[PDB]
Amino acid sequence: TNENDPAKHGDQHEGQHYNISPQDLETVFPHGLPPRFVMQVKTFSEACLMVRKPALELLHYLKNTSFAYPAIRYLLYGEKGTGKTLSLCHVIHFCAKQDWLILHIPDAHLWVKNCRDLLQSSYNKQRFDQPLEASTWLKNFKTTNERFLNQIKVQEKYVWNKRESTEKGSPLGEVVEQGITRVRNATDAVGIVLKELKRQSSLGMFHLLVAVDGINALWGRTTLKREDKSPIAPEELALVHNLRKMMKNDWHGGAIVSALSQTGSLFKPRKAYLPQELLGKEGFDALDPFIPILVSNYNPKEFESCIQYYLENNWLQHEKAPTEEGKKELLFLSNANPSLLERHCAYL
Amino acid sequence: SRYSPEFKDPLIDKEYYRKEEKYVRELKKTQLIKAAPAGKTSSVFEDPVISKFTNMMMIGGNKVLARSLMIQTLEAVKRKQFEKYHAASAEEQATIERNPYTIFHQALKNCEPMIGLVPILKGGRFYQVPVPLPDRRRRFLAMKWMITECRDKKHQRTLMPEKLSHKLLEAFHNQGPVIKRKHDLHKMAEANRALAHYRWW
Amino acid sequence: TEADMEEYIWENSSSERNILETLLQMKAAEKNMEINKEELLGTKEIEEYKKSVVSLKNEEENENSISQYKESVKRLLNVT
Numbered sequence: 001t002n003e004n005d006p007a008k009h010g011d012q013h014e015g016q017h018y019n020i021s022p023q024d025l026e027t028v029f030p031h032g033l034p035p036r037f038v039m040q041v042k043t044f045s046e047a048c049l050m051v052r053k054p055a056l057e058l059l060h061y062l063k064n065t066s067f068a069y070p071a072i073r074y075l076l077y078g079e080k081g082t083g084k085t086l087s088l089c090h091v092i093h094f095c096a097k098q099d100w101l102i103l104h105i106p107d108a109h110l111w112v113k114n115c116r117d118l119l120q121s122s123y124n125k126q127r128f129d130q131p132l133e134a135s136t137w138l139k140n141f142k143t144t145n146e147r148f149l150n151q152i153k154v155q156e157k158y159v160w161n162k163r164e165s166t167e168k169g170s171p172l173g174e175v176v177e178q179g180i181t182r183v184r185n186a187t188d189a190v191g192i193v194l195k196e197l198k199r200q201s202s203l204g205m206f207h208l209l210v211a212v213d214g215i216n217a218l219w220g221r222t223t224l225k226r227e228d229k230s231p232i233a234p235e236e237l238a239l240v241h242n243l244r245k246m247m248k249n250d251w252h253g254g255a256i257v258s259a260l261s262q263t264g265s266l267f268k269p270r271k272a273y274l275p276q277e278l279l280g281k282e283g284f285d286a287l288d289p290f291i292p293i294l295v296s297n298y299n300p301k302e303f304e305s306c307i308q309y310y311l312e313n314n315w316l317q318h319e320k321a322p323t324e325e326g327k328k329e330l331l332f333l334s335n336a337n338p339s340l341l342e343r344h345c346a347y348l
Numbered sequence: 349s350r351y352s353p354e355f356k357d358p359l360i361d362k363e364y365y366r367k368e369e370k371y372v373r374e375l376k377k378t379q380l381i382k383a384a385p386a387g388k389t390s391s392v393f394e395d396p397v398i399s400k401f402t403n404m405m406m407i408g409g410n411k412v413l414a415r416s417l418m419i420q421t422l423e424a425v426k427r428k429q430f431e432k433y434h435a436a437s438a439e440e441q442a443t444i445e446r447n448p449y450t451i452f453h454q455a456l457k458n459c460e461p462m463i464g465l466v467p468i469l470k471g472g473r474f475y476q477v478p479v480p481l482p483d484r485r486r487r488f489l490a491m492k493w494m495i496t497e498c499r500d501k502k503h504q505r506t507l508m509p510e511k512l513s514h515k516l517l518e519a520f521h522n523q524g525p526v527i528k529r530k531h532d533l534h535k536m537a538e539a540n541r542a543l544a545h546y547r548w549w
Numbered sequence: 550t551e552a553d554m555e556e557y558i559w560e561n562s563s564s565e566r567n568i569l570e571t572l573l574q575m576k577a578a579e580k581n582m583e584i585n586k587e588e589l590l591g592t593k594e595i596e597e598y599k600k601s602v603v604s605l606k607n608e609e610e611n612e613n614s615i616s617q618y619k620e621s622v623k624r625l626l627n628v629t
């Protein structure tokens with residue numbers, strides 16, 4: 001049930017649970033969860049994550065990985081309700097313990113859709129602006145990480161419309177504060193710091209890691225429209241174009257991880273979870289090869305271990321449920337689906 | 349109506365199925381039987397209380413939304429009880445009850461009044477008179493009163509899940525508008541006592 | 550163009566990405582051996598990746614096909 005070694009893991013004991021620290025919650029990943037599960041763990045008041053077979057296999061990949069090889073690309077995909085993104089957060093935890101520069105985004109659905117104010121950029125042309133989300137992710141990355149910002153030492157300058165500029169040998173904490181102070185050019189600040197991360201090709205001072213959730217939103221059309229009642233293409237958006245031009249496998253110093261999510265998929269049908277189906281033709285042309293990782297449903301013993309975890313937490317107040325017929329009907333109606341399992345144990 | 353009069357409704361308790369009793373069982377075996385409904389199921393996680401609650405809160409035949417909102421409210425009550433447990437000392441946790449199902453049952457059977465007022469005709473004036481009510485009548489009245497005091501235009505902004513969760517936690521120990529108006533109903537009965545003689549049933 | 554040719558062909562389309570994906574690793578892993586592109590494409594694992602991409606991208610994909618594609622990428626990039 002419970003595990004005493006949270007950082008290191010093994011295959012021998014599967015379905016185990018390992019506790020984590022509050023500083024690891026608030027510093028490593030304060031954003032990269034669904035708000036449902038965020039509040040769910042807040043109500044837990046006891047942060048314990050479960051081990052997964054594909055998670056351990058991906059960790060084995062990371063353990064057996066050379067950075068002289070090109071930047072490897074991993075894609076997690078489940079059946080719309082598995083633990084793909086939670087295993088991605090587990091990878092984030094492992095790499096943070098490994099002391100790498102991790103940049104993790106909450107979701108790209110929020111980027112491509114639901115912008116309160118879409119703007120002619122001055123740093124470029126033929127490009128809208130995502131200022132609010134830019135500053136949001138900027139302060140998000142600041143909260144995620146500090147010595148890295150202090151020691152980044154950008155070897156290039158950047159002027160600004162605000163009668164100011166930034167010169168060599170300065171830490172990009174100052175551009176982080178720029179974007180947090182004013183949000184208009186925060187999109188340009190983000191699209192510039194992302195390029196600056198790769199501007200250092202050696203990456204000996206740190207090792208770069210990219211973590212993406214809802215990758216399906218990155219490849220696909222937009223719901224936004226132009227004020228003249230005209231559609232908007234995804235590549236026209238500032239952040240979309242920046243990210244697309246940016247993640248290319250050109251830095252070749254580690255790995256990047258992305259996860260699929262159909263719950264927020266737009267212009268796509270229900271009960272569709274195949275990678276090719278989600279990322280489309282343009283996605284396959286963007287990254288023809290990659291490491292697909294199928295995140296299957298819970299195993300039997302892992303399922304019973306999760307039940308025992310809930311019982312130790314006294315999550316199920318229905319005290320006639322801990323019995324053979326109750327468990328049978330429970331996992332029969334659940335079909336080992338983690339999300340509906342969480343829902344059922346929540347409202348039971 | 350549709351089903352022939354020969355058909356009868358079956359029961360659901362598999363614990364009652366699996367073993368004069370055998371004589372009535374043989375009579376039922378000889379008799380015919382219709383199809384069971386879609387709402388009721390022999391699973392342990394169901395009861396006619398929540399069945400009636402869903403059927404009452406549902407509107408326009410949106411049973412899926414009704415039950416989703418019901419389970420959302422159950423989760424809300426559960427999280428409130430869990431925060432109570434986490435904040436309370438050990439001795440107070442030993443007393444705090446967390447099961448939202450029992451919380452709901454207690455609130456309902458505390459809100460339920462055992463007497464009502466019936467309008468009776470006298471001359472050219474209708475007068476309210478105290479009358480004992482049946483169990484099903486009291487249950488229906490309490491449920492509808494709870495739901496109608498939960499949903500109201502006074503809290504048009506805040507959301508009905510948390511509204512009714514708070515109302516249930518209030519009525520769990522005889523508090524809230526339902527309880528206060530039940531007390532007012534008892535007062536109205538105490539006022540209209542002497543008119544009891546007007547009832548012939 | 551590719552939009553007109555609905556059945557892609559392993560002539561230049563995927564080769565554009567494969568040249569980069571191979572040389573970016575050969576510069577370090579191979580120590581600038583400068584192996585010829587046809588000599589690289591004449592190997593067995595590259596043909597297996599070719600036929601995997603064919604079976605996956607041309608017709609309906611399945612769990613076994615996706616597993617074969619995963620193993621193909623793994624054997625090609627020799628990361629294990």
Ligand SMILES: Nc1nc2c(ncn2[C@@H]2O[C@H](COP(=O)(O)OP(=O)(O)OP(=O)(O)O)[C@@H](O)[C@H]2O)c(=O)[nH]1
Pocket residue numbers: 034037048049050051052078079080081082083084085086087260261262263264338339342
């Ligand atoms: N404790 C624990 N819960 C898990 C694990 N894997 C899955 N779950 C449960 O399953 C739910 C789904 O996990 P997510 O990764 O957030 O779901 P998703 O990948 O966003 O799925 P979609 O976005 O709907 O496509 C979680 O909220 C958990 O309740 C696990 O490894 N440990």
